[PDB]
Amino acid sequence: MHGGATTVNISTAEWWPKALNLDILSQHDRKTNPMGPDFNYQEEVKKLDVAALKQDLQALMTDSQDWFPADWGHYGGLMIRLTWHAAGTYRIADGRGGAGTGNQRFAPLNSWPDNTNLDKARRLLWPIKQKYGNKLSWADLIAYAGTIAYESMGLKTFGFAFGREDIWHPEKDIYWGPEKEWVPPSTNPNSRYTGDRELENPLAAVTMGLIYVNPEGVDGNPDPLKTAHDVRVTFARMAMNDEETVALTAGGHTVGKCHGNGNAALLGPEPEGADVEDQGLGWINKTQSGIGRNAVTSGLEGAWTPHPTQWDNGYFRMLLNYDWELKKSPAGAWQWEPINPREEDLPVDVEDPSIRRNLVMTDADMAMKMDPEYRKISERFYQDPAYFADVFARAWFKLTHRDMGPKARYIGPDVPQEDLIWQDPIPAGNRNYDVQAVKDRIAASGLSISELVSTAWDSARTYRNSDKRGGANGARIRLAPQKDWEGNEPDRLAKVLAVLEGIAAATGASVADVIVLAGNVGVEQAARAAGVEIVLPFAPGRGDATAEQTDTESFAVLEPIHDGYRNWLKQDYAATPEELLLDRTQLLGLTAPEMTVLIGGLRVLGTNHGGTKHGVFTDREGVLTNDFFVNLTDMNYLWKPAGKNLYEICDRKTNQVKWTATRVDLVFGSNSILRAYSELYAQDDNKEKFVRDFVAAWTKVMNADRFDLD
Amino acid sequence: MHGGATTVNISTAEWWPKALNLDILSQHDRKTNPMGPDFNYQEEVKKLDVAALKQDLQALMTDSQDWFPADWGHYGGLMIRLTWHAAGTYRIADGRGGAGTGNQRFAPLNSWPDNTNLDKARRLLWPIKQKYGNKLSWADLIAYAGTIAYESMGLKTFGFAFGREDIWHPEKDIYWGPEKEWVPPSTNPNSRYTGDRELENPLAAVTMGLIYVNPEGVDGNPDPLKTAHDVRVTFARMAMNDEETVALTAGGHTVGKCHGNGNAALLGPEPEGADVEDQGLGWINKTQSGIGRNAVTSGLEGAWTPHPTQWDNGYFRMLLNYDWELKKSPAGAWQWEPINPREEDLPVDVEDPSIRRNLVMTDADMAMKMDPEYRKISERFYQDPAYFADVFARAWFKLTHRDMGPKARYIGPDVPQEDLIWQDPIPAGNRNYDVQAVKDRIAASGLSISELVSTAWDSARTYRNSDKRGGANGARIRLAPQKDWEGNEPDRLAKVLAVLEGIAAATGASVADVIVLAGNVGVEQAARAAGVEIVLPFAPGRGDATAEQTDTESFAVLEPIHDGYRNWLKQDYAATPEELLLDRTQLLGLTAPEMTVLIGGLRVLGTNHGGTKHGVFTDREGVLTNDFFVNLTDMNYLWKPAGKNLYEICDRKTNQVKWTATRVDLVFGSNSILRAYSELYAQDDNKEKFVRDFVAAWTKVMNADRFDLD
Ligand code: HEB
Ligand code: HEB
Ligand code: NA
Ligand code: NA
Ligand code: NA
Ligand code: NA
Ligand code: NA
Ligand code: NA
């Protein structure tokens, strides 16, 4: 009987649940990190004995352990599902989810129902991780395991990169969905479906705790054609088209099996709710045998191919050349079993090969036959297995690297030399030119501070840390579709580019470098005007990317349809503007203090989309002062709602309107943590510190995607 | 429509609410801190123009602002309540709460119903804070404001110290109580009362959102005698006795008033739930006038003295010399009004002094008359106002500094020279002696590694960061009551002290220094045995404190009745052992990685209370290895519950018991974040890093209370 807020329900979240979640900006900080401050994963993995790792990891595939034994003595089916599940969390709308963090070994992902028994796969990889230590992240190891499984079972994988830094707690910033319970039907309160059964728009899974779709059909009601539709939708939202989707499915199910030979209700709590006795595992059956042929995982039961420990062309042979019908697994799940199979085609039992068990297909497998489009592709792969194997290896590769960012992050011997277009490739840019000359030319041009800063911000604000897409490198802002994005103010952007494209031509520095450098000039000028001399650090080397290497459609997802930093809202979204601001800043990789200084600066540099005055609390627009905070924080004004996302700042004495402001602006004087920051910067003694801090933050954002350097 | 977990309800806490709250170990870290890494508050406040501050702060007391105007043009009543409320959150059981952090300016405290309109007081202090900047924390400023108010209204305050570092978010580790709603009656589900209406034991308030007691009586039912009882209980749990309690109450209510002249339902949401228009304030009345004489705060209405802007002897004159009866304030609250008051005794109106309003007493005031004990003291203060004024100034001082720790933290011109016993005073100790000689003598003694380490841990484990009590300085472990604490294993402690007291005599280093130094030796020896040569940093200067300056009863609250670090549980508490472990580590100021390494080390140094083997997963007890993690993490064992807080670690092959372990031990292989840490340290490449890290952590704990140095 004691005073500590010692379990997680005990917080401020249950009184004010609509409160901004500023903690998402303060994740992964010094105190959760057990590593030294100098530890750098990138140089350590560079020293790794990969070839020896490959050897070990292969041997593990047939090194059955007695506490969770390998099917037929081959762990490869299981390890593929590991890696598949690790990666299949990715969603393009915001880049969140992915295998790029090794997130599956913490809540919530470690305890999702779809990840049943992958706790066993991870645990099985521990002794390898134990051996290679700091030179091998769980992230990389988890990501590799299925690729080696493929290799060992006879697939020519297309390659692999290391470079995924482990994290030390759950990614708090990822919203997985509205549901308060696991795999509830879509006809429920808190549903992720709206309208014509359209999926709520960031989300890429059909319900809470699934990776993509329900294998027993839409809400557990088999109908291949309805399943087909969910698969198309979901896999598109993880950036895979029809071809790749058929390939992945066929390719996955070409090996391994479904486990469901027991009673699912005998299984214990999932890992985050199991007791300490379970060694951080879950779904343990203590009532009976939960392992070998008695294993209950998804609850479907059977294998898809006659030889599930090998790559072969069994999947389509079974799917296309037999007829199928509904049946119930032993644990009570809908599945498809073929009509009159031959004995020779029956997968044998996982423990004793003299016993024949059954074949299966899921509703998602049957979708590959019954959907007309999927059908044609299935036909193509059945007739052309070289092509199937090559489409699959590529998609497997894209699956597992989709979120790794530019090739500059890729490390190791099996990195393909091809620049895949989804790697958003950018050439190295020229580094030997006279920086000061470029500055002088930018300065010499007729371009306003705000023309310069806005253009540079907009080049950079696309960055997102979730999958390391976007940023100022490559200068894709000059290319379609970006140059026409309403948020980017095309005429102004056009105007500035004409100019900066010229300076770049004359100097042999990339438009990319010039754009950032101009931002830096505008800042330096505004600081000069306030009587501060600073020279902002600057790093050259950015490339310009070609339209050819710019997939127009993949970039839709990075359009800024909102940006608090420039008081931009393209429409009238359900999310409040300040939540939208928090999302973006979290993607940018920024802290709450950093978010605060940026808003203060940009406002007084006069950078609002549309040259709007909202939040410009200065007499000296263009001059880099702490005036935004100084006036925000002053009780001579009262604040009056004036419609949608709009307030009037009124003098208490004269009752006259002095400025206008948006919620983005005023949340910084409303939220008690943000006002604390604002107050600090409005202190008489903090004018220099505001400037040094804005500059630092500006700089962090301009160098966010510069992985070619570190 | 977007993917960010952008409001606070969205987390892992709603799936696994019984999960350990490891975030309480990672608060106040680099990324929430807007200051530079070198910024040190202690040296900055040292440069503060205090005398000028005093001047400004006094002028503010009668500088009424029009948006929340001062009663009679004196803000002093209000500022006293600020500081009173800021401090009255303190509770002795764990030291949590207090004015020592400036916590009231963030959730939840800024929005508690008892703190209604103190949002206005804080805001009123902003321009002073704005002026003095980094040299003045909101914490200190908030703590000073009422003391200056006292001075300006005619009280001789006993003094003041600066030195309270601001924080930048709510103190997540403080459990405020079980209730899911504000000020609910004690006859409810989720009640903090149990048995004979006994208060649930860390807690020091009668319900959620109150500071101490209900001013309308127990559950809003007036009965001075029942109130008396709650006041005695609550104020004792904030370390104030009968005398001090009467004094504080009389002293507080000698100035200021109760506000409740309106309809409380017209008031807007409290700050954390008000909209952005409200400038981070709350309880705004937009329907009518919420200010001046129309102010609704507690909902009682009237003043306690005829002259509420001054210190005088009005409180007891009114309380004792009139008779009182129940009435209803305008807003519907129970209060006491006197029978047949004279006109001259009526406080005038807050806006216009030609109008007389009414007197009041709360149920807590009437308790001071009706409780027999309180009565005698009230009589004493009524007859002896010099004594009342001096008892009050002292208690006001103790109120506002109770949590500031040793005098070494106190800064500024008005620091009293008296060593108050609640400051747990410790003399400076001798620093010129030969460290190496002491080591050699400790080494030369017949004392085991585990004798040395356990004794040193136990001297130090008392530290708590909440109010900066405890620690190894002063060596109070040799004094009553500590030397007899069952947790401290008195015979062993006695044994070791005999020895170390001798070495201290011979060397002129404090028993305190010797005790720590011996811990350091035992560690150095164990590391030597593993073939590592280290010399642990060491800082001399600790004093020995006298029994005279050791208040025996105040130290009850620091007894270790549980300690995971030595597998100690005195009894069978409701809280699980791992929660108890988390509490203690949070108080120690430790991170989760630090907690992890300590448990691993201590276990293999063989330091369990009772020389129990639980968690000692080594063949080489006494040798500093990463074996605890190595064996913990190994799936050759299975773990079997074996009763209360006890498990058998069994070989899967032989089905034989290899070791035993407690929950404290195994949570480190169960919790997914802790197992991640454990796994790291069980890596083949991390034997040195384990040792360097244990050592660092050991060291952090031995120097935790060494404020005399920094
Ligand atoms: C690439 C790859 C891949 C992909 C894409 C997939 C996709 C899928 N999938 Fe899969 N899976 C898999 C690969 C996969 N997969 C594998 C490998 C397995 C195996 C496991 C073992 O063997 O253990 C599975 C398994 C599985 C199962 C069973 C589990 C158990 O154990 O029971 C199910 C239900 C499923 C479903 C599914 C669906 C619905 C989908 C959508 C289409 N799957
Ligand atoms: C030291 C100090 C102090 C102390 C201890 C106290 C203690 C107390 N208290 Fe107090 N208060 C006070 C000081 C105080 N106090 C003041 C100063 C005031 C005033 C406020 C103004 O004036 O604004 C009050 C006020 C008050 C009120 C009113 C509020 C309004 O505005 O409405 C009430 C109800 C109370 C209660 C109380 C109780 C129940 C207790 C327990 C005993 N308070
Ligand atoms: Na991601
Ligand atoms: Na196969
Ligand atoms: Na066969
Ligand atoms: Na405290
Ligand atoms: Na008075
Ligand atoms: Na009078």
**Could you write out the DSSP letters of every residue in B533-601?**
-----------BPPSTT--TTTTGGG--SEEGGGTEESS--SS-HHHHHHHHHHHHT--HHHHHHHHHH
CA distance A279 to B348: 71
Contact A590, A569 (CB under 8 A): no
The alpha carbon of A91 and the centre of ligand 4 are apart by a number of angstroms equal to: 29
| Residue A30 DSSP label | T
CA distance A62 to A72: 9
A265, A263, A264, A283: which is closest to A273 by C-alpha? A283
A545, A544, A543, A525: which is closest to A535 by C-alpha? A525
The alpha carbon of B245 and the centre of ligand 6 are apart by a number of angstroms equal to: 20
CA distance A168 to A179: 26
From the CB of residue B349, how many other CB atoms can be counted at a distance below 10 Å?
Answer: 16
Atom of ligand 2 nearest to the CA of B259: 32
CA distance B700 to B696: 6
3-state DSSP assignment of residue A400: helix
CATH architecture of B564-685: Orthogonal Bundle (1.10)
CA distance A419 to A159: 13
Strands (E), B206-360: 257-258, 302-303, 324-328, 334-338
A362, A413, A367, A371: which is closest to A114 by C-alpha? A362
From the CB of residue B344, how many other CB atoms can be counted at a distance below 10 Å?
Answer: 7
A694, A682, A683: which is closest to A532 by C-alpha? A694
* B94 to A680: CB separation less than 8 angstroms, yes or no: no
From the CB of residue B537, how many other CB atoms can be counted at a distance below 10 Å?
Answer: 11
* B140 phi, psi to nearest 5 deg: -70, -40
B371, B395, B706, B417: which is closest to B538 by C-alpha? B706
CA distance B304 to A434: 77
CA distance B494 to B500: 10
- Beta carbons within 8 Å of B461's beta carbon, 6+ residues apart: B470, B560, B563, B565, B584, B588, B701
Token couple for B9:
């309800």
Class of residue B192 by CB neighbours under 10 A (exposed 0-12, middle 13-18, buried 19+): buried
Class of residue B320 by CB neighbours under 10 A (exposed 0-12, middle 13-18, buried 19+): middle
CA distance A456 to A472: 8
What number of CA atoms fall less than 13 Å from residue B672's CA on the CB side? 27
Please pick, among B2, B28, B85, B259, the residue that the annotation labels catalytic: B85
Contact B534, B524 (CB under 8 A): yes
The reply to whether A1-176+384-418 and A419-563+686-710 are identical in fold is: yes
What radius of gyration, in Å, describes the C-alpha atoms of chain A?
28
CA distance A7 to A45: 37
Token couple for B8:
């606070």
Q: Which residue has the tokens 């006659």?
A: A306
CA distance A622 to A603: 9
A490, A464, A495: which is closest to A477 by C-alpha? A490
Contact A291, B638 (CB under 8 A): no
B411, B422, B385, B425: which is closest to B143 by C-alpha? B411
B333, B340, B331, B378: which is closest to B359 by C-alpha? B340
Residue B684 to residues A126, A145, B623, B673, Cα–Cα distance (Å): 12, 20, 17, 20
Q: Which residue has the tokens 């308030």?
A: B205
A256 alpha-carbon distance from chain centroid: 28
In chain B, the residue whose alpha carbon lies closest to the alpha carbon of A584 is: B4
Q: In DSSP terms, which residues pair with B105 in a beta bridge?
A: none
CA distance B13 to B17: 5
CA distance A564 to A662: 9
B8, B707, B465: which is closest to A4 by C-alpha? B465
Sign of CA dihedral A558, A564, A567, A571: positive
Contact B93, B78 (CB under 8 A): no
The CA-based diameter of chain A, rounded to the nearest angstrom, is 94
Structural class in CATH, domain A177-383: mainly alpha
Contact A348, A308 (CB under 8 A): no
* A666 to B15: CB separation less than 8 angstroms, yes or no: no
Q: Which residue has the tokens 């005829």?
A: B306
* A13 to B8: CB separation less than 8 angstroms, yes or no: yes
The DSSP result for A304-341, as a single string, is SSS-TTS-SSHHHHHHHHS-EEEEE-TTS-EEEEESS-
Atom of ligand 1 nearest to the CA of A234: 41
CA distance B242 to B237: 12
B533 alpha-carbon distance from chain centroid: 39
* A411 phi, psi to nearest 5 deg: -135, 140
Helix axes A224-236, A242-253, angle to 10 degrees: 110
CA distance B485 to B560: 8
Q: Which residue has the tokens 């050439």?
A: A427
Show me where the domains of chain A are located. Answer: 1-176+384-418, 177-383, 419-563+686-710, 564-685
Distance from CA of B280 to the nearest CA of A (A): 4
Please state how this structure was obtained: X-ray
B85 is catalytic: yes
Contact A483, A455 (CB under 8 A): no
Contact A203, A227 (CB under 8 A): no
Q: Which residue has the tokens 């404001």?
A: B145
Residue B81 to residues B8, B151, B361, B591, B638, Cα–Cα distance (Å): 31, 15, 16, 35, 58
Chosen for mutation from A14, A18, A29, A31 (greatest number of chain B CBs closer than 10 Å) is A31
3-state DSSP assignment of residue B659: strand
Helix axes B511-529, B435-444, angle to 10 degrees: 70
Residue B9 to residues A27, A286, B188, Cα–Cα distance (Å): 17, 35, 25
Residues of A in contact with B49 (CB under 8 A): none
CA distance A509 to A188: 57
Residue A549 to residues A95, A197, A463, B501, Cα–Cα distance (Å): 20, 35, 18, 77
Token couple for A509:
């520095």
Contact B598, B697 (CB under 8 A): yes
Q: In DSSP terms, which residues pair with A372 in a beta bridge?
A: none
3-state DSSP assignment of residue A31: coil
Q: Specify the CATH number of the domain B419-563+686-710.
A: 1.10.520.10
Contact A649, A658 (CB under 8 A): yes
Q: Nearest Cβ partner of A67 from B6, B635, B684?
A: B635
Q: Is the omega angle on the peptide bond into residue A108 within 30 degrees of 0, that is, cis?
A: yes
Residue B569 to residues B561, B562, B640, B647, B703, Cα–Cα distance (Å): 6, 5, 20, 15, 25
Structural class in CATH, domain A1-176+384-418: mainly alpha
Q: Is the omega angle on the peptide bond into residue A184 within 30 degrees of 0, that is, cis?
A: no
Residue A299 to residues A113, A333, A360, A507, Cα–Cα distance (Å): 11, 6, 12, 65
Residue B126 to residues A164, A380, A689, B129, Cα–Cα distance (Å): 46, 73, 19, 5
CA distance A461 to B46: 43
Contact A398, A147 (CB under 8 A): no
Contact B320, B383 (CB under 8 A): no
The alpha carbon of A424 and the centre of ligand 3 are apart by a number of angstroms equal to: 15
Strands (E), A179-278: 193-194, 198-199, 257-258
Token couple for A248:
């992945």
* Amino acid identity at B414: D
Atom of ligand 1 nearest to the CA of A260: 32
Token couple for A603:
């406002």
